[PDB]
Design an enzyme around this catalytic site. Structure first.
Site, PDB file in Angstrom:
ATOM      1  N   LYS A  29      36.361  35.694  49.615  1.00  0.00           N
ATOM      2  CA  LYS A  29      35.058  36.199  49.141  1.00  0.00           C
ATOM      3  C   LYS A  29      34.210  36.695  50.268  1.00  0.00           C
ATOM      4  O   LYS A  29      33.270  37.437  50.017  1.00  0.00           O
ATOM      5  CB  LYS A  29      34.342  35.124  48.363  1.00  0.00           C
ATOM      6  CG  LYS A  29      35.107  34.812  47.073  1.00  0.00           C
ATOM      7  CD  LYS A  29      35.362  36.097  46.265  1.00  0.00           C
ATOM      8  CE  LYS A  29      35.661  35.703  44.807  1.00  0.00           C
ATOM      9  NZ  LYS A  29      36.493  34.491  44.788  1.00  0.00           N
ATOM     10  N   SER A  62      44.026  27.483  43.298  1.00  0.00           N
ATOM     11  CA  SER A  62      44.369  28.846  42.902  1.00  0.00           C
ATOM     12  C   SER A  62      45.506  29.398  43.748  1.00  0.00           C
ATOM     13  O   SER A  62      46.305  30.208  43.263  1.00  0.00           O
ATOM     14  CB  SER A  62      43.147  29.758  43.003  1.00  0.00           C
ATOM     15  OG  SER A  62      42.824  30.018  44.356  1.00  0.00           O
TER      16      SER A  62
END
Lengths: 306, 312
Positions: free
Chosen positions: A45, A267
């Site tokens: 991110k 994830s």
């Protein structure tokens, strides 16, 4: 070693790739993982936090000193707090009051201000407050699920890095978990143009298989399964979808940490599990690549490593 | 084609990412009429701290020498970044790791070490480190386990001589480094980097940083302190007691406040030992003035210490 840089955001990108050795059967295709947690803020991110701020600068929507608002407490909030601290912006994040103290400290460590919303209202309450600050107070909202700068930065940086990293080698499949979908959409576009026969595979939680047509549901694949189709996701980019259960992803994250020495979030365990199915389906000599969005150390308070 | 940063081609295992850490110039916590301050981000090592370097070097030398082979068990009495680095490297290279520690080590840390597959052997919390060291030796003698010995193994200062140092020295080619400062835990970073920089920069000043609350290098008594990773309470065998020209003592609150300033004003979120090293580096930067160059090392990342008072 890189020459000194004036600003920490100049370290964002250029992340390394590691070939998996033990969790993949030698009968299957090679599996490579891109360590996006090597970004200086700790996750993939970092890339969209910088791109979103940079684009708003270019377009005159913000100038250093201005205030930003986003309804998130996950890795995008950390990335925005990091980038805003590094570039001289004020970051405000809305989140339900039920969010953990450890995560509040991390955001506050970067100087961000937190606006807590009613706990029963959950995410919808945080979004409403953010819309209020944007529409009634002129705060800039990056909007990670709709800003085209999100998939575009992966088209410009993450994807071409993989092209340089796999120069002269053909990638047979690229797999990525879908959060905003910016990674899969932007890397996918670049890899498919360079490798027209590549398979692009979306990864999503078994318990919330929205891309597969199923119903949104609670799940434990932090960072994945937003519960809707993001505006930042190119639904045409993937040829297939692999669904991963909660326990399956956790088990593989534990396996990869112990047998490869790679400590990544849940994830990432889902991404590597799916990459290993695809590898075995593709067979020896082929090349499978996926992305590890975050470090396992960010999740020590979860059942992932308890 | 041309819009991305250069990325290294795939490596065969994660240990090959250890090293090659970047350097950032500080912009806001340092006055422009002071010397430039540069920080080497050792938390960019894949395991999260400077200790990746010595964990790999110590294991690799034990292989080169034939003391261990993959599948063997390592034992070390520690709970900090050295245990993390050793757990990380052992997982990556196929070694078993057993660490001893007092049972008062935090649970998040226990999970971290265990995430890499290390075993944790808990000793009476009232026997403290002496108890963890004793249990490590008993296991070492009973099972023949190899003990890296982070405070005595010469591979520790040597790897900083062969990697960390030459890195800075190529990161600062064509520039003069006027002072290099480093907090002393094992002393390996200061010793190895200092040896290498001294050979290239004859006028350089090498500064050891230790806690004001446990200034053993200065000849004070070892005491409790809050500068995690620093102030071992003794003079380690791995520290070259002749390498440093001077010593800077840093207080607990002083380092914490600097770490919070750097996080908010530079966007660099590092541990408390990094705030101590940056505080000392700015102090050094103030006396010697504009135009000079001071360099220090940030050993760990602030996210590792979220459960401590550093960032609450």
């Amino acid at each position: 070693a890189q020459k000194p840089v004036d600003n920490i955001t100049q370290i964002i990108g250029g992340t390394p790739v590691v070939k998996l050795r033990n969790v993949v059967d030698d009968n299957a295709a090679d599996v490579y993982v891109k360590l996006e947690y090597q970004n200086p803020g700790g996750s993939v991110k970092d890339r969209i936090a910088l791109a979103m701020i940079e684009k708003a600068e270019r377009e005159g929507k913000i100038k250093p000193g201005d205030t930003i608002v986003e309804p998130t407490s996950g890795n995008t909030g950390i990335g925005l707090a990091f980038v805003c601290a590094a570039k001289g912006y004020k970051a405000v994040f809305t989140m339900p009051e039920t969010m953990s103290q450890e995560r509040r400290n991390l955001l506050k460590a970067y100087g961000a201000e937190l606006v807590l919303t009613p706990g029963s209202e959950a995410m919808k309450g945080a979004i409403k407050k953010a819309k209020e600050l944007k529409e009634e107070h002129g705060y800039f909202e990056p909007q990670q699920f709709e800003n085209p700068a999100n998939p575009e930065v992966h088209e410009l940086t993450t994807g071409p890095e993989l092209l340089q990293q796999f120069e002269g080698k053909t990638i047979d499949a690229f797999l990525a978990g879908v959060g905003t979908g910016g990674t899969l959409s932007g890397v996918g576009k670049v890899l498919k143009k360079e490798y027209p026969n590549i398979e692009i595979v979306a990864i999503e939680p078994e318990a919330s298989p929205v891309l597969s047509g199923g119903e949104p549901g609670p799940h434990k694949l932090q960072g994945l399964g937003a519960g809707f189709i993001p505006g930042t996701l190119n639904t045409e980019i993937y040829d297939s979808i692999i669904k991963v259960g909660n326990d399956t992803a956790m088990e593989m994250s534990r396996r990869v940490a112990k047998e490869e020495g790679i400590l990544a979030g849940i994830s990432s365990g889902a991404a590597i599990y799916a990459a290993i199915q695809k590898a075995k389906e593709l067979g020896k000599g082929k090349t499978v690549v996926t992305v590890l969005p975050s470090n396992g150390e960010r999740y020590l308070s979860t059942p992932l490593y308890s």
